[PDB]
Amino acid sequence: IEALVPAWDSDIIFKCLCYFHTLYPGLIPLETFPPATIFNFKQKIISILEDKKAVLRGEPIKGPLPICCSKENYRRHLQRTTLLPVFMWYHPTPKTLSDTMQTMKQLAIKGSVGASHWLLVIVDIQARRLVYFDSLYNYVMPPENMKKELQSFAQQLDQVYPAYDSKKFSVKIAAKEVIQRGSGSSCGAWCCQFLHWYLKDPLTDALNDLPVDSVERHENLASFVQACEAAVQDLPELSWPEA
Which entry of 21, 77, 134, 192 is annotated as an active-site residue? Predict the structure, then answer.
């Protein structure tokens, strides 16, 4: 027994992020392919923050550059952005970035999700918070382990992107239990739903207010998915919103 929730791949997630930007201009709609992975999400975030610093200094971008965005529009986004939505594509089997990309490619050809999984890392620059959302709670590793990893990373970000008041990046592991209970392919949608809740209200623990019943929980997510798919219908194709 499973509520019907569409699988959201890199293309639909990106469309949703573009839509979210128009609602919350501080959100930069980072491209979802090639995706962040557990092997390079930290370095990816650092590169983006370094490029924001460069833009704020009126210096050239170092990259990497967006595929669906002009150079100038990307600079406009970096100037403005307060929040990085980093989507990490994960699979238990591959042991390197190269093998992860190969597995993703194979699964895409098959039109299958398999054991693959989307994680969300929110880098809130304005509030200086790192938020890790795993709809499966501990799929990659126990949350206490990810917390330690991200505490180390937070210290690094304090050096890469310092605050004048020397405020330190904080870390939050958002899910306190398995969220995606009884569902096999809803992780992309869950990440976007969590992201939307966070954009509306970064304090309220929306996850705690979910129905205990697995089906009702995912039928609510399906309602959210339906609302999003309608909203992104007419968004320009493979093209960032104009900042």
Answer: 134
